[PDB]
Design a protein around this ligand. Structure first.
Ligand SMILES: CCCCCCCCCCCC(=O)O
Ligand SMILES: CCCCCCCCCCCC(=O)O
Ligand SMILES: [K+]
Length: 203
């Protein structure tokens, strides 16, 4: 059964393709001046069950969920492992403009690329940006699917239409870090993701 993000009311399927399970749902906000804040989009983080089970079975053999979750290394082990994942975004804010959005993800993704990769990923960041070169609008209720395909290949689909891919371990890691890393857009979503990822191997 679908999972509804309460604040926005947006719904996310419990799974995608029977193999990719929804583990966490959150909101990406934009902090404005003072007490002003805007909910930009809701997101759902999915992970392939078999891939997660293999990681746990290999690095956390015979350990209970609580002990797996209790390991400070768990989060980084998941992100670095070859685990197929999907980040589904559903636009909440209705007055976004393409220029503003491009500058926003260039900054967020850019911040992460320099954090994890060579001090010169401009071309890498540009290959990502180019995926949205044909988009002129980004209205409320639009759905974007960012997927980590085998071999750390980042694929993007907008409104159900595949728009391109970029094979880069660095890019995959950077983007995922925004949602499930040390400094995520939504801490509650990250905690749920880690809690459920830890439990997923025992289903
Ligand atoms: C899909 C990428 C979402 C990131 C875009 C965030 C940009 C914030 C919008 C600015 C809010 C405002 O209109 O004052
Ligand atoms: C016109 C389509 C624009 C969609 C851009 C999707 C980019 C995903 C990364 C967003 C990270 C962030 O929230 O800053
Ligand atoms: K604020």
């Amino acid at each position: 059964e679908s999972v509804v993000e309460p604040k926005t009311g947006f719904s996310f399927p419990a799974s995608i393709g029977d193999s990719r399970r929804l583990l966490g749902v959150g909101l990406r906000k934009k902090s404005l001046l003072g007490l002003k804040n805007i909910d930009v989009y809701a997101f759902g983080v999915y992970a392939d069950c078999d891939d997660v089970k293999k990681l746990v079975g290999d690095k956390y053999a015979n350990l209970p969920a609580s002990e797996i979750r209790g390991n400070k290394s768990f989060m980084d082990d998941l992100m670095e492992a070859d685990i197929k994942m999907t980040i589904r975004l559903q636009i909440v804010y209705g007055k976004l403009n393409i220029r503003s959005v491009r500058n926003a993800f260039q900054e967020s993704v850019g911040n992460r690329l320099k954090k994890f990769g060579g001090s010169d990923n401009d071309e890498l960041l540009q290959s990502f940006t180019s995926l949205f070169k044909d988009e002129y609008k980004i209205p409320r209720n639009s759905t974007i699917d960012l997927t980590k395909d085998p071999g750390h290949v980042l694929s993007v689909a907008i409104e159900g239409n595949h728009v391109g891919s970029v094979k880069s371990h660095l890019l995959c890691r950077s983007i995922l870090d925004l949602y499930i890393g040390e400094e995520p857009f939504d801490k509650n979503a990250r905690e749920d993701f880690l809690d459920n990822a830890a439990s997923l191997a025992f289903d």
